[PDB]
Amino acid sequence: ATGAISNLIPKLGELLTEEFKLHKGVKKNIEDLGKELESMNAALIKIGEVPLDSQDKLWADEVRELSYVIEDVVDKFLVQVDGIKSDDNNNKFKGLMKRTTELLKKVK
Description:
The protein is built from three helices and no strands. The longest helix is centred in the first third of the chain and has 44 residues, at about 5-50. By secondary structure, it is an all-alpha fold. The two termini are about 20 Å apart. This is CC-NBS-LRR resistance protein MLA13.
């Protein structure tokens, strides 16, 4: 037999494609939100030059509430990204590669 290599090839292919779909989906979501926050930031700067009513005050509170909501989602994403970098299973690559390369040295 060839060990688990026959089973490993389609699993790595499944992992490669699913990781690629996840990256592109997350990358697009962050960029699309960043585009709208930059557009909102530019609009709020133009309004700051205007010499406001109660509706402006209410919408200012809605802007502040949205900032909290987005900041919470982004801060927790940064924490999870930091955790994946320090993850135990994610750090096993270098340990497997060292054993993999040393065995392939004996081949050639």
